[PDB]
Amino acid sequence: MMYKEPFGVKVDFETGIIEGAKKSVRRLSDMEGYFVDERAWKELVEKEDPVVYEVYAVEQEEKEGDLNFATTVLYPGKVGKEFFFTKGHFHAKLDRAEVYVALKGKGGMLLQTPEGDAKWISMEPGTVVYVPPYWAHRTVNIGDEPFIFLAIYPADAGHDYGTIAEKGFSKIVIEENGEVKVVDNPRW
Amino acid sequence: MMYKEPFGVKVDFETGIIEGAKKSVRRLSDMEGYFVDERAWKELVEKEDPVVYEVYAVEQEEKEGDLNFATTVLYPGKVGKEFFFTKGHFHAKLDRAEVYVALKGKGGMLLQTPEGDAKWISMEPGTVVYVPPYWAHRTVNIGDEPFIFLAIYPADAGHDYGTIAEKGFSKIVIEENGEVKVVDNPRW
Ligand SMILES: O=C(NO)[C@@H](O)[C@H](O)[C@H](O)COP(=O)(O)O
Ligand SMILES: O=C(NO)[C@@H](O)[C@H](O)[C@H](O)COP(=O)(O)O
Numbered sequence: 007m008m009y010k011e012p013f014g015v016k017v018d019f020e021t022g023i024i025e026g027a028k029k030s031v032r033r034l035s036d037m038e039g040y041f042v043d044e045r046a047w048k049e050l051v052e053k054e055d056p057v058v059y060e061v062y063a064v065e066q067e068e069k070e071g072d073l074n075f076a077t078t079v080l081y082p083g084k085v086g087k088e089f090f091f092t093k094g095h096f097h098a099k100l101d102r103a104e105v106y107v108a109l110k111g112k113g114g115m116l117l118q119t120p121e122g123d124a125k126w127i128s129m130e131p132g133t134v135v136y137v138p139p140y141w142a143h144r145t146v147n148i149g150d151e152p153f154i155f156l157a158i159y160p161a162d163a164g165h166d167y168g169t170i171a172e173k174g175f176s177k178i179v180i181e182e183n184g185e186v187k188v189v190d191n192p193r194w
Numbered sequence: 195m196m197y198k199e200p201f202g203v204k205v206d207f208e209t210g211i212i213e214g215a216k217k218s219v220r221r222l223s224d225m226e227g228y229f230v231d232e233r234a235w236k237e238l239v240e241k242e243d244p245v246v247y248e249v250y251a252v253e254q255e256e257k258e259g260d261l262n263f264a265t266t267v268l269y270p271g272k273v274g275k276e277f278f279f280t281k282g283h284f285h286a287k288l289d290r291a292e293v294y295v296a297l298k299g300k301g302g303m304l305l306q307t308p309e310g311d312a313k314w315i316s317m318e319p320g321t322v323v324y325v326p327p328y329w330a331h332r333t334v335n336i337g338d339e340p341f342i343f344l345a346i347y348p349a350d351a352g353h354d355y356g357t358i359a360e361k362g363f364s365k366i367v368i369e370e371n372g373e374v375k376v377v378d379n380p381r382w
């Protein structure tokens with residue numbers, strides 16, 4: 007039988023750039039219906055339309071046992087009080103776990119179950135996050151520099167964005183009274 | 195609707211230590227039949243018996259789609275001309291892939307197919323190695339300081355050490371004339 011070729015790729019923990027990877031870019035305009043403050047979103051899109059995050063994904067065929075890996079560069083910023091975040095998703099195969107290795111910056115992960123059980127995990131360089139089966143996950147940049155991390159996930163996990171896209175997470179991550187706060191989403 | 199708890203753990207990139215992890219120690223005396231120079235192995239065991247490597251593992255139950263992670267501290271040394279290495283294994287579920295992230299030191303990975311064809315991947319801090327389905331894998335420390343890396347692998351992958359314990363890899367990594375060389379294993 008044919009065996010796939012092993013490879014190494016150098017990843018600058020300062021940039022998150024992977025050569026040979028599929029690069030995807032999310033601007034604020036790619037994120038309509040995601041942030042609580044809709045008027046703040048609209049204004050920011052018209053003034054700047056900032057890049058919220060970039061992903062460098064090295065992806066295999068959707069086979070059991072195989073592994074994908076991707077870095078994310080999550081840029082600093084706010085939409086009103088709400089910190090820049092990733093869209094967030096469940097996996098297409100719900101019971102697929104994931105491992106995150108925080109590389110640069112200050113951020114965290116919001117995770118929630120299909121029942122809306124909600125978890126916040128602080129992330130700083132060296133933080134490894136176990137994302138268990140069934141937990142949807144969004145990363146958040148709570149600092150003023152790029153938040154960079156590596157994600158390793160089953161090649162057959164898939165990305166399920168729909169239910170998060172309409173309903174969001176049960177918690178939001180805001181700056182209020184000079185504090186980073188994880189509070190109940192009002193639109194939830 | 196029981197779900198497992200998400201968590202974050204600090205991995206120290208300088209030392210490899212994961213506080214709370216399952217720590218494993220492998221001494222040279224636990225590696226009979228692994229190095230070409232058996233007399234050199236015997237002597238180094240009788241006089242010192244160094245730790246060759248340590249593993250800090252965060253493991254889940256053996257379920258499909260779940261993920262384990264572990265750091266290895268592979269200490270610097272030689273047995274005769276042959277650099278210290280990990281025992282090396284195939285996965286019990288052969289088609290399970292793996293992703294390594296090099297954190298500190300100077301090393302590399304020896305990989306081989308069930309047919310004994312071998313590959314070498316140099317690893318320096320920042321190197322991410324994709325270990326494809328079906329490839330056995332051994333890491334080697336080619337420098338004078340600890341070689342430290344993080345591995346992420348399917349939780350149902352398992353470890354099979356059998357044929358490697360008997361026959362090793364078809365290639366060896368040695369120092370010869372002040373130079374690191376990947377050469378054919380004379381035993382093969
Ligand atoms: O969790 C991952 N992979 O499965 C990550 O690689 C995410 O896919 C990545 O950070 C981008 O975020 P969204 O996919 O939520 O837009
Ligand atoms: O590949 C891994 N996990 O599957 C690694 O975590 C290895 O198990 C670890 O580096 C120790 O090497 P041996 O298992 O060959 O002694």
Ligand SMILES: [Zn+2]
Nearest residue numbers: 097104143159
């Ligand atoms: Zn995911």
Ligand SMILES: [Zn+2]
Nearest residue numbers: 285292331347
């Ligand atoms: Zn392995």
